[PDB]
Design brief:
This is Pollen allergen Amb t 5. By secondary structure, the protein is of the alpha+beta class. It has a single domain (about 1-40), classed as Double Stranded RNA Binding Domain. Helices cover about 20% and strands about 15% of the residues. It contains one helix and two strands. The chain is globular and about 25 Å long.
Length: about 40
């Protein structure tokens, strides 16, 4: 919840999505929801 989630290639998320306001997180998953949720 403490961050954002978008699609593209900023964390090697080719095929899924990622979450990173700057990089300290850079957490990607297949469930775009897990990206916003589990990422932080």
């Amino acid at each position: 919840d403490d961050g954002l989630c978008y699609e593209g290639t900023n964390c090697g998320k080719v095929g899924k999505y990622c979450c990173s306001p700057i990089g300290k997180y850079c957490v990607c998953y297949d469930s775009k929801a897990i990206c916003n949720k589990n990422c932080t």
